[PDB]
Amino acid sequence: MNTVPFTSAPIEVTIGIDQYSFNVKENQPFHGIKDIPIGHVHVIHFQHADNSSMRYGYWFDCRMGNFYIQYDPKDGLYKMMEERDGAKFENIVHNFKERQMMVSYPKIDEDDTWYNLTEFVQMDKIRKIVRKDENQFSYVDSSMTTVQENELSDPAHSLNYTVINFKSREAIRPGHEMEDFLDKSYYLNTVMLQGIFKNSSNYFGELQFAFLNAMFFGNYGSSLQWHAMIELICSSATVPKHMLDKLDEILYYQIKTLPEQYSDILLNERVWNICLYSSFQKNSLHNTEKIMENKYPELL
Amino acid sequence: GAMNSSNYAELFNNDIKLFVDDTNVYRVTVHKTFEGNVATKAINGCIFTLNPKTGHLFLKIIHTSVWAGQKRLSQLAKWKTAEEVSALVRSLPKEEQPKQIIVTRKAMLDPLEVHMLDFPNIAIRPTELRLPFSAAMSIDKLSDVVMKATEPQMVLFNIYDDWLDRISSYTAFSRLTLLLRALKTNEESAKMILLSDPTITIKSYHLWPSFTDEQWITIESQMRDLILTEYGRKYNVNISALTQTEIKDIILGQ
Numbered sequence A: 001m002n003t004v005p006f007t008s009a010p011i012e013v014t015i016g017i018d019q020y021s022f023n024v025k026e027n028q029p030f031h032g033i034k035d036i037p038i039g040h041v042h043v044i045h046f047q048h049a050d051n052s053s054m055r056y057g058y059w060f061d062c063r064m065g066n067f068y069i070q071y072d073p074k075d076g077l078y079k080m081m082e083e084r085d086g087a088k089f090e091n092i093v094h095n096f097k098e099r100q101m102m103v104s105y106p107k108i109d110e111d112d113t114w115y116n117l118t119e120f121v122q123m124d125k126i127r128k129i130v131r132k133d134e135n136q137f138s139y140v141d142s143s144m145t146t147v148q149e150n151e152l153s154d155p156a157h158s159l160n161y162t163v164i165n166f167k168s169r170e171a172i173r174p175g176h177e178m179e180d181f182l183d184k185s186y187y188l189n190t191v192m193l194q195g196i197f198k199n200s201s202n203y204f205g206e207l208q209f210a211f212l213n214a215m216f217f218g219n220y221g222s223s224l225q226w227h228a229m230i231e232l233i234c235s236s237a238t239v240p241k242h243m244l245d246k247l248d249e250i251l252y253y254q255i256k257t258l259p260e261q262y263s264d265i266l267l268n269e270r271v272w273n274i275c276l277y278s279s280f281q282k283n284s285l286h287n288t289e290k291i292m293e294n295k296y297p298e299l300l
Numbered sequence B: 001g002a003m004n005s006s007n008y009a010e011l012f013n014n015d016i017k018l019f020v021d022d023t024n025v026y027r028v029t030v031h032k033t034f035e036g037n038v039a040t041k042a043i044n045g046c047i048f049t050l051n052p053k054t055g056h057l058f059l060k061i062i063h064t065s066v067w068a069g070q071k072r073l074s075q076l077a078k079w080k081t082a083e084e085v086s087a088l089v090r091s092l093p094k095e096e097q098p099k100q101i102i103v104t105r106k107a108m109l110d111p112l113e114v115h116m117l118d119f120p121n122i123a124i125r126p127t128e129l130r131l132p133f134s135a136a137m138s139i140d141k142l143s144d145v146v147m148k149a150t151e152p153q154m155v156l157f158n159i160y161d162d163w164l165d166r167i168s169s170y171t172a173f174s175r176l177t178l179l180l181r182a183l184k185t186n187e188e189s190a191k192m193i194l195l196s197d198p199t200i201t202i203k204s205y206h207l208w209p210s211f212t213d214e215q216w217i218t219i220e221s222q223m224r225d226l227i228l229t230e231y232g233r234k235y236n237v238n239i240s241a242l243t244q245t246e247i248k249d250i251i252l253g254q
């Protein structure tokens, strides 16, 4: 079980770890998060009590290095940093643990929620969407724009999600205009799956990462990417059975996890109505359709 | 964005544009079968592609063979329209290609956009104008060429005849829309008005009669009165009560 120690908590802040969160008071003796499950990516995220615009976080995997958080009073945020000195780090963690100044990652043993949300998400794929090659962890915030949003302004601070555009040459083969526009199977299977993602696992990993960035940071471009990737599958007449069954599981856990109160901003009426009721795959997402109908019937 | 009353003069500027109307592409007669079911029989249709500035009409005849063994024909008709418009643009020299295509029906926007991805600088636009281009098939010579076609065929017309020798494209377009609006509301009466003097003939190379400027003013009057008469007969409204502000507004409104 890995640990992300904090140097200190000089400013009052809501700290998130994956789907959990807790309030820390200005100069509270908080020295970090222990018992973090190995085997998955994690996201530690922040919302300053004095300024809710300040909403940001770090994707990391504790198998890749020893990471800690330290407040930077100049840039005015909690920064992730890597500790290179193994022995210094082990000794820091041991002290804070002995003094019980660490919150425990509060995983219920029955609870597969985080695994279910991150099943296909891999740090190496995150690091290609979020380019900052000197760090092993990835910074995301509420205001970072996607490469696609920037085409329609700082390239270095962008989310490099795969551009999906239903009305692009990429999506539409010359001479198959109506066929490719009405049945996106070519775009899904040849361009995206075989061509760009190489397999359904990478496609689902980006889909899951987009959802999580949408939910944890209210990142609008991430929400757009998550909906495009769902719509591209639901608008394809020809999808491998395993992908449809897996999509239903993926979406079910995403809808299950979404805060009830954020449904209005994070869910696109047109895409969900189309995907559940109109699309080729309208009868292929039983779990997702049941949770959406029971949780969010107004949207539909 | 959308073409409306506000930006109407833009039709007559020197940026090449085409209207595309797909109403007469997919045409059927509905009939009873022997077993008492209903069936359709397709007839020849046409794409109505018009340069509102020049009067140049690219009448692409849609032969019933297009539809053979195809499903969801009203949907296919949009995509076939978009294919034929894109093939027309591609066939034109670069300096004759339109900068804008205005579709008369919003269901044409996606089909045309997807067929024109090779032309990202051609703006595909809807219009808020209620244009009477469906009545194109009430112009005898246009109806005849469509009905006689035995294969796909493009036929080129000037829908303004020689009017641009005497009037502006603004006035030519208003005259054309008033004629088509009349033909659409009461074809019989509209045509009777256009032939009421057998001395004024239609030249072999024209669609409309050779009216003098004075006769055009009279004809335009009779067309407006017909649109008003029919609007009266439709809504059970006493038209002899109406004002000139009330009146103008129901050809406008229409």
Ligand SMILES: O=S(=O)(NCc1ccco1)c1ccccc1F
Pocket (backbone or CB within 6 Å): B138, B139, B140, B141, B142, B191, B194, B195, B202, B206, B207, B208, B209
């Ligand atoms: O329908 S036409 O082809 N053109 C419009 C029209 C109607 C009456 C006069 O012009 C036509 C009909 C009847 C006699 C000659 C024609 F040119």
